[PDB]
Structures are given as C-alpha cells and as structure tokens.
Design a protein around this nucleic acid. Structure first.
Lengths: 53, 247, 257, 50, 194, 133, 147
RNA sequence: CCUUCUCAAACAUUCUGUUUGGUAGUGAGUGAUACUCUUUGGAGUUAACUUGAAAUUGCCUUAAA
C-alpha cells in the first residue's frame, strides 16, 4: 500500500521543518492543517522513510 | 415622508464634503500666495487612468489644455454646498448627464479639484468633439414672433451666421474649428452651444437594464476614485471611450 | 551644554525618592517606574494642534530592555506595523522575522488600512486592540488618514499614537527602506508629541532601565536637540508627582515677550 | 448546559475531507483531460466567437 | 492568607501571577489530576515553561521531572494535592492552592514546613486587596485558541468536568454545589458549560 | 400622568437639532428642541430633549421610536411626567484659543523665573533629595 | 427586519455555481503549482434545532408562514427555554432568498466575522427589546377574536 | 444605513540612503504635582485609568415606480 504524490510532499515539508519533534510537529498550524495526532505522524513518516533512504 | 436614516445620512455625508472642500480651499489658497512653508505638497499632479487598469502619475504643466467635463451624479447622500453651487452654475452643469467645453489653465485647475467628485473630466480627440457637435447641439434664441426660451437644434448654418457672423464664424464646422483649436472665438461659441445633452448609460430599470446598471455601477468605483485629501490628484479618463458609450 | 553633574545628582535623588517604605501592581509600580522629563516654552505650536511625534535622537535604546522585561510584566510589549493596501499583498510577516531577528526585534502583527475601518471599527474592539500594543508604526501615506480610523482615545497616550515611517524608494515600495527605518525609530529615536500649550513632558519611561550613568546620556542628548531646534524656557526631571528637579533655566528667551 | 453531552468530532475543527475528496476528483479529471481548467476556458473564447 | 476572586477572574488572576513570578519558585495545587493536564498545556503553549505532574503520567517521568525541579533555580511546576504528599521542597516562596482542598484540616499541616493563600468567592495570615484593572487581557485570545486546536478543547473539557466533579465530592458546608456554571466555564474559556 | 416634553438618548453620530426638529416635525408641531454638547469642542453628547405642543403627540412618538435601530445604535425615547421641563441646554460651537500673553515686561518675569527656580532647588531639600546647582 | 437582513445578506451560503467554479480553481492551481473556516447562515430545521441545544445559535430566524403550522410551533418557546435570542421574521420566501433555496422555514447565525460581531450583538439586543419585550403578552392571550 | 485627507519634493545611489513638509480626535467620568502665560478668570499643556458608540438639561432625481 503505497503513498500519493501530495501525501509524500506533505511529509517532506513536515520532516524538513521539524524532524522528529512530534509535539511541535502536530501543534503546527501551517503544515499539519488537519489537526492529526503524534501516532498518525510517526506511522506515515516511517512509511515515507522505508520507501526512501 | 422622509425617513430618519436618510436625513442623518445627508448631514453625515455633507460633513465630509464641507470639511473636504474647505481643506482643498486652504491648500490651494496657500499655494497661490507663495506661502509654501508647511503644507502637504506645493505642486499639482494629474492621474490618467486608461485601459488591467494603469494609474499614471504626471505633473500638470503650465500649458493651456482642452477638457470636456462630463456630469456624473456622485456621491450618494450628498447635498451640494455653496462652493459647488457656484462652480456648477458658472459651468452651467446643474443637470445630470450634461457636458461642456472649457480650457484648462493655472486658474481653472484649482476649481477643478472642488467639483471632481461631481464631474468626470478628460482631453477629447478631434472625432469626439466633431461627432458630438454634429450629433448634439442646442441654440437658445427667439421662436416664431413672441416666445424666447426655445433651445431647438443645430440644423442650419444660416442660424450660425445670424448669431455669430462678424467674429469670422459662418458654419457649424467653423464652430468645431474654434472649439478643437483654442482661438479668439472660443468664448463666443462656447456660450452658444451652452451645454450638451448626453444620454445616460444603460437608461432603464427592468430585467436586463438593472443587471447592466449593476455591472457598470461596480465599474465606476474601479475607474474612478474619490481622493478626499487636499493633495487630490485630478483623475483624467479616456473621453474617446466614454463618448463611444454616450453617443 | 548642560551640566552632567546636576543630572547625576538629579537621578540619585530619584533613586532615593523611589526607595521608599495588594497582589497586583495597579498604581504603585507605575509611580515607581515612570520618569518624565519636562520641557517648557512660550506657546509650543501655538495655534495648530497637529499630532506629529518628534523623533528625538538618542544614542542608547530604552525600547530594548522595555521588550526584554515587559516579557516579565503583565502588560506585554508588541510591535505593530500599519501598512498600505499593496504592501500586505507584497510582503508577509516571515520576511520581517527573517531580517529583524538578526538584531532581535519582533514584528507582532501587520495591519492594513482596510482592517481599522471594518474589523476594528467597533469602539470596544478598537480600544482593546490598540491598548494592547505599545509601539505603533505607520507607513507615511496612511499617517494623515489615521485620526479618523483609530479615533481620539488612541491619541490621548504617547504609546498608542503612530510614528511616520518611510517605506518608499522614489515612491516605489521596497522592503529595505522599511527594514532600516524600523531600526532607526526603535533603537535610535524617542517619540514625543507637541501640544498647543506651554508644558511638554518627555516619556522616558521606567527608571529601572539603563543604569543612571546611561540615563545622563539620554537626558543630555534630549536637551541637545530640544534647545537647538526650539527656543525654550525651563526643564524639569520628574517621577510621578515628586517635588520637581529644576535642571535647565533660561532668562534670555523671555525678553522677546 | 446543553441537553446532551455529545463529544464534538475532529472534523468540526479540521478542514473538510469531503471538500478534499471533490478536489482530488477534479484533479484526476484534469490529468485525464476531461475537465478543461478555468485558466484555459478564457483562451477557448478569446480565439472563438469573433 | 487568601484572595477573593470570581470564577471568571480565577485563572485570569493565576495567569497574571505566573508571568511576573517567572524568576521565583512557586507551587500551584489543583484538586483533579485532569485539571493540570490542561493548565500545563496552555502555559507551555503561551510560553511560560511550567512543569507537569499528575497521576495519569508514568512514574519514571514523574520522578525525572520532579527531580529536575529540586535541582533548579528559576523553575515552576503544576502538581496535585495527593501527588505532592511527602516530597515537599524548601526552595519555595508561594504555596498557592487553586482548588478547594481534600481535607480542610490536613492543609494546615501542609503549610508549616513559603506563603499560603486560597481563592474563594463561593467559599493565621492576611488577606490580599486586589486591583480590578491590571488583569491580563488574554481571554478572547484563549477563546479563539480553544475552538481551533481540538486537543486543547478535549483537555479543557476534562479540565472543567473533573474540577467540577471533585467540587461535588467535597464535605464542607461551603463547598456544596453553589457556584453557577455561567462563570466556571469562562475559567476554561467556553460559550456554553460543555 | 405624562407630559409633552420628551427625552431621547443613544443618538446617531451627527443627528443634531436640525434633524431632530425636521424628523420629529413629521409627527407634529414641536415647541422647543435642544441637544447637550461638549464645550471644549462643539459636538453632541448623543442625547437631547424636545417638547411637543401636544401631549398625545409625545406618547405616539414614544410608541414608534422606543427601540429603533438607527446606524449602529438603537434610539431610546422616554416620556416625562408633569414637571421636569427643558431647562439649560445651550448650542455650544467649537471654542477657539485666545492669545493673551506678553503684557508684563521681560525683566519682571525673568526674576519671577529666578524666584521660582531657586525655590525649586529649595523644594527637593524639603523631602529627602539633595541636588547641586 | 431590514436590519437583520443587512447582516444576514453578508453570509449567503456559497451557491452551487460559485462552489463549483472555486473547487475547479483549487484543482487547476493546486495539482500543478491555510484558509480559515468560512462562516455562513445555517438553514435546515433538523440542523437549527440541533444548533439550539448545542448551544451554538446567537440569532435564530423563524418564518411565520409554514405549510404545516405544526412544524415550527415548539421552536420559539424552545428558543426562550435555551436562552437563544430568536426572532420570528415574516416570510419563508424572504428567508429563502438569503439562502439559495425557494423556502427555508429557519435561518440561524452561529459564528460570525469580527467586523459583523458587534452589529450581531446589537441585533440580538434590538430584537430582545423590540420583539421579546413587546410580545411578553403573546405567551398569554388566545388570538383571533376579531369581530 | 454614505464610510473616512491610502504621498510629495531637495539632496544622495550603499540594489535605498539622508533631510524637509503632510493627520483638528464619539461622548461621559476617575485621577495622584508640575509646567509657562495671564493678573483671578482658568488660558493652554503634562502620567495614567474606566466604557456593549454608554448618555436627565454646565450662561444632482433612471439611487425610480
């Protein structure tokens, strides 16, 4: 189950601006427009990281 | 019956207009007396808006220019003050949708800033002038034998002879000559065609005409602004385009 | 040139007057903090009640520690920027942070002329908006339009009335002209009004800021610019309702009356 | 108090996902070429009906 | 001794204190452990870096944060009544219990070990005269902030509820469900009492 | 009972005696109209009083204007009982400054300034402050 | 009524054409090369009587002419119960106009832009004084005794 | 039921710098010593704070029908 172009580019933005600070990453209004939890973010980023380097 | 809301709105708008006219009056009086010690600006800009709407900012030269002032009806709740009654009486523009020719000099330009929310100005072309005179034209003179106030039409050239004649003017095209080119007989013939009677835009209240008036009414505030400041740049518009709409 | 010794003696007497024998700081802290240097003249701007803020050049910033420990104070110090209708379409807050965090000043909110006449046009909404902010900056063009849009209560203070800032390089807007003029107004200038009467105080602010030797440099340069530009009568250093401190006293200006 | 103690959903605060569904449906339709974009629709009438 | 404040001006007055007393070491006590999960989220969000202590968090976190407060110089924590029992720090100047206490008698023993005061409009040392004008104007900022995060809507929901549930499970004649909910909601910033 | 004299408050920004007389004239013949204003500058306090020649006209106006949303704030109108007449409200314009200055000679005010300045240095010493010059 | 609509006309729900063109603008831009939640009037009876009792309604407008009268009979008194500042306005057609529908029966204003906030609060107070205070006798008194 | 004075020069080009001028404000009230003038009248200034735009009387016509 792969990821879409827009979802991948969204996770690119989150990682490049924050890195791994999931508290700060989910309290960001600009990138995390859908007010999603920490668990959703670490799961989706690891899917992004497995498909990349 | 007059509603309360309207009767307060009229005063609330004339407060802005009385204070605005006094403000422009002060800065123009202090500009002429060479007491430019502490005012906003001691010179005159002219805005030329053309057609995607480019706003130009050019200073007014001392050169005498030719303008065709067109009556607008604006703004909404305003009653005209004494300083507006005076200038619009001198230019004979009490009636809405009504044009007149005047030359623009260093004396004419300060009076232009007062009436700028009531008039729309601009330098016309040779075709705008020539088509306007051959399409519209009034002459106040005697009727059959008794009646005086008949204003009829520029049908003839022998009427032009009888009223002007000896000044060198013989025909309607000669009137167009002394209006397009600033000459000796311009003050003679300018008060001969007294004002013009331009038809209003859209010209109806109904199905198509209300919507077309809505479209044009929102186009007004885009193609014309009220500066309200004492250093108001005079808005010049295309009269070739405007009289294409009004002929 | 004014004697620096009498300035040192004045502020030392202000230290002694502030060191004297509730859970919030309603009045006690303000009367402790607020220094004002009085400047007297025979009829300042005698007939015209214009609201221009004279930007008196000072070597050392008092706005800087006013930021650093208004962070500790209940009333926060936040920097407002009133701009024109094309500027916010052109320039965001992020570019201001990009070029002003370099020295360490923060633009709180950027405000259009539209916003003061629609969203902040309600009187309580207007009052509660402006009274929050201490530094009010306004682009040169909008300054003349602002007595109507923000009202009279915004002008009764010295904080809430705007400072005319130039943002136009030959009438064309540029970010740089804003970037350096915000610096000059902030760190190198102290604003003060000019009433139509005789008395004028200069709100230097809190006594606690810039150790008294620096306060001498503040007062010195203020007199160096207010006696040169205008002929004046008297100068007094005053913390809120003290027995006054007569600093400068002139006897050659009154001869013309 | 209100009559019921019903917990407010995330979707009442978060940007709508139905809107996101519609947008990402029109996106497909533009890639496929079956919806001509609003920018090119002007160009189709600037060249025609003259 | 005590400060008299309404349920509107309750957290308003608390927030007014914590900014000015950033330099010092003060203690805030709540009844619920689900109330501190709200306050230690707001104050960290509006950048007053407070410390968080409650029953619902893990023991190693509860130890390694409270240890850091003991070795600090400038710090500030939020902890409950029951969790802070037996481990008190002398490095203190204000012991300020916000909610009504568990035992009205055992609180006297909690003090004489720091300055003590309470908050009571519905309900020795000196009282404190309070200025009405110099409260911080961060309420409508919080009202906008609550209805735009969800996480802080939920923590405020179970802040308000758990506080009021603990208020009803009291024993005194003073603390027996008298306080109206049109005031208590604005402490947690609401238009309706949840 | 009630009387012809009326009280109106919550008036619009720029609703003066000119428009109070003109609008309430349509209800009938009004006797005498005023509006309370500031003296420092000539502008309305947003409340005024007007009297009708007919008591019944006063109650009809009150019935129709008691809650009238008029440009951002609703008109409040109240009848008055027997007595409580319209007394002392004056038309105050914008008051201008008058330049009374010099009269006294320069040497009089100079030594007056010397007296006030030396006493000023002798004022700080009264309350715990010592300052040179 | 005119002053209620001078506010309510500023919150027309985005018409089917306007919504379609904007969401194709989203597609034509975003697929090739942040916004706040927008405020509109709320207009279904299931949804209005949902919003009252939430309690999210600041002004609930009720039509006087409804096809079965029995539909909207509880609503003014449920609004007086909840403390929702209601106004029975004249015409379901007139409510229909501000809402892209032929008829609406009910229109509500939950949230608002801050420019319109003070006007809305005053609209509440004007309606409280004009409507609820003049018609405190209307909870009493059987109507229709006209000879 | 209209919406508000939305920029100019003189010098200087460091990719915009300096200098000069431009704003008359809802009302009502609380308020702790100082400033000059005037000759007794406040004249005009000087911190700050309160407030749903609050309030009981200081001697042109096609923007129509």
């Amino acid at each position: 189950r792969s990821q879409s172009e827009r979802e991948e580019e969204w996770l690119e933005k989150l990682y490049k601006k924050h890195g791994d600070d999931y508290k700060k990453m989910f309290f960001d209004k600009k990138l995390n427009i859908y007010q999603q939890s920490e668990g959703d973010l670490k799961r989706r980023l690891l899917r992004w990281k497995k498909r990349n380097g | 019956f007059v509603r309360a809301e309207s009767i307060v709105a009229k005063t609330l708008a004339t407060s802005r207009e009385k204070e605005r006219i006094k403000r422009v009056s002060i800065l123009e009086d202090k500009k002429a007396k060479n007491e430019t010690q502490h005012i906003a600006s001691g010179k005159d800009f002219i805005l030329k808006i053309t057609e995607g709407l480019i706003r130009e900012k050019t200073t007014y030269d001392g050169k005498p220019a030719l303008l065709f002032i067109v009556r607008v009806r604006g703004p909404l709740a305003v009653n005209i003050p004494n300083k507006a009654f005076k200038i619009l009486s001198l230019l004979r523009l009490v009636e809405t949708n009504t044009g007149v020719f005047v030359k623009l000099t260093k004396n004419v330009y300060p009076l232009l800033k007062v009436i700028a929310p009531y008039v729309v100005i601009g330098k016309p072309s040779l075709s705008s002038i020539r088509s306007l005179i051959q399409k519209r034209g009034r002459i106040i003179y005697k009727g059959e034998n008794e009646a005086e106030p008949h204003e009829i039409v520029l049908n003839d050239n022998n009427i032009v002879e009888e009223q002007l004649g000896d000044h060198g003017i013989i025909c309607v095209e000669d009137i167009i000559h002394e209006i397009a080119t600033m000459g000796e007989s311009f003050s003679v013939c300018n008060f001969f065609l007294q004002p013009f009677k331009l038809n209003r835009e859209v010209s109806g209240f109904g199905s198509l005409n209300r919507l077309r008036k809505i479209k044009q009414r929102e186009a007004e505030s885009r193609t014309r602004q009220f500066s309200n400041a004492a250093t108001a740049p005079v808005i010049e518009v295309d009269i070739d385009s405007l009289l294409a709409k009004l002929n | 040139a004014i004697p620096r010794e009498r300035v040192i003696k004045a502020v030392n007497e202000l230290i002694k007057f502030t060191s004297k024998p509730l859970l919030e700081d309603d009045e006690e802290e303000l009367k402790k903090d607020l220094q004002l240097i009085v400047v007297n003249n025979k009829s300042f701007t005698g007939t015209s009640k214009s609201f221009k803020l004279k930007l008196l050049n000072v070597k050392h910033s008092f706005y800087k520690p006013w930021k650093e420990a208004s962070a500790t104070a209940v009333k926060d110090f936040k920097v407002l920027l009133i701009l024109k209708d094309s500027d916010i379409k052109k320039v965001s807050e992020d570019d201001l942070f990009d070029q002003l965090d370099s020295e360490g000043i923060k633009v709180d909110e950027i405000i259009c002329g539209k916003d003061l006449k629609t969203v902040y046009k309600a009187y309580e909404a207007r009052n509660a908006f402006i009274s929050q902010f201490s530094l009010i900056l306004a682009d040169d063009s909008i300054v003349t339009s602002l007595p109507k849009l923000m009202g009279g209560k915004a002008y009764n203070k010295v904080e809430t009335t705007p400072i005319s800032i130039r943002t136009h390089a030959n009438k064309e807007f540029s970010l740089t002209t804003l970037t350096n003029n915000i610096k000059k107004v902030y760190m190198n200038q102290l604003p003060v009004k000019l009433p139509r009467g005789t008395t004028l105080n200069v709100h230097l602010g809190n006594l606690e800021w810039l150790r008294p030797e620096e306060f001498v440099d503040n007062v010195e340069l203020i007199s160096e610019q207010l006696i040169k530009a205008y002929q004046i009568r008297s100068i007094f250093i005053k913390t809120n309702r003290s027995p006054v401190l007569p600093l400068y006293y002139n006897q050659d200006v009154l001869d013309e009356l | 108090m209100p009559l019921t103690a019903v917990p407010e959903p995330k979707r009442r605060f978060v940007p709508s996902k139905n809107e996101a569904k519609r947008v990402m449906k029109i996106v497909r339709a533009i890639r496929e070429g079956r919806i001509i974009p609003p920018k090119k629709l002007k160009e189709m009438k600037e060249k025609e009906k003259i | 001794g005590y400060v008299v404040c309404d349920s509107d001006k309750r957290f308003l007055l608390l927030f007014s204190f914590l900014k000015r007393n950033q330099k010092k070491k003060i203690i805030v006590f709540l009844s619920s452990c689900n109330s501190v999960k709200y306050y230690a989220e707001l104050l960290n969000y509006i950048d007053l870096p407070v410390l968080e202590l409650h029953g619902k968090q893990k023991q190693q976190k509860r130890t390694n944060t409270f240890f850091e407060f003991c070795n600090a110089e400038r710090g500030i924590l939020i902890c409950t009544d029951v969790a802070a029992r037996g481990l008190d720090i002398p490095a203190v100047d204000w012991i300020i219990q916000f909610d009504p206490p568990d035992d009205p008698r055992d609180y006297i023993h909690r003090v004489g070990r720091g300055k003590s005061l309470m908050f009571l409009t519905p309900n020795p040392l000196n009282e404190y005269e309070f200025p009405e004008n110099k409260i911080a104007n961060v309420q409508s900022q919080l009202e906008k902030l609550i209805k735009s995060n969800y996480y802080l809507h939920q923590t405020a929901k179970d802040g308000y509820r758990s506080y009021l549930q603990a208020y009803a499970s009291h024993s005194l004649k003073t603390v027996y469900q008298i306080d109206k909910l049109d005031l208590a909601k604005v402490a947690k910033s609401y238009g309706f009492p949840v | 009972e009630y009387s012809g004299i009326i009280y109106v408050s919550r008036l619009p920004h720029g609703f003066h005696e000119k428009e109070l007389s003109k609008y309430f004239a349509q209800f009938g013949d009004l006797k005498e109209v005023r509006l309370a204003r500031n003296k420092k500058t000539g502008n309305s306090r947003h409340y005024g009083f007007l009297e009708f020649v007919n008591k019944e006209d006063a109650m009809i106006a009150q019935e129709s204007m008691n809650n009238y949303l008029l440009m951002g704030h609703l008109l409040q109108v109240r009848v008055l009982p027997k007595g409580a007449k319209i007394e002392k409200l004056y038309k105050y314009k914008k008051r201008v400054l008058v330049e009374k200055g010099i009269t006294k000679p320069v040497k009089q005010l100079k030594d007056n300034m010397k007296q006030k300045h030396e006493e000023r240095i002798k004022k700080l010493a009264k309350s715990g402050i010592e300052f040179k010059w | 009524a005119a002053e209620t609509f001078k506010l309510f006309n500023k919150y027309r729900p985005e018409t089917a054409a306007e919504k379609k063109e904007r969401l194709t603008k989203e597609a034509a831009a975003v697929a090739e090369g942040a916004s706040p939640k927008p405020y509109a009037v709320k207009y279904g009876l299931n949804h209005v009587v949902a919003l009252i009792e939430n309690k999210k309604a600041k002004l609930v407008l009720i039509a006087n002419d409804v096809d079965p009268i029995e539909l909207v009979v509880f609503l003014p008194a449920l609004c007086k119960k909840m403390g929702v500042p209601y106004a029975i306005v004249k015409g379901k057609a007139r409510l229909g106009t501000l809402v892209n529908q032929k008829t609406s029966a009910v229109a509500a204003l939950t949230e608002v832009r801050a420019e319109d906030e003070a006007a809305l609060a005053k609209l509440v107070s004007t309606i409280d004084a004009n409507f609820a205070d003049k018609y405190d006798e209307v909870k009493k008194h059987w109507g229709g005794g006209i000879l």
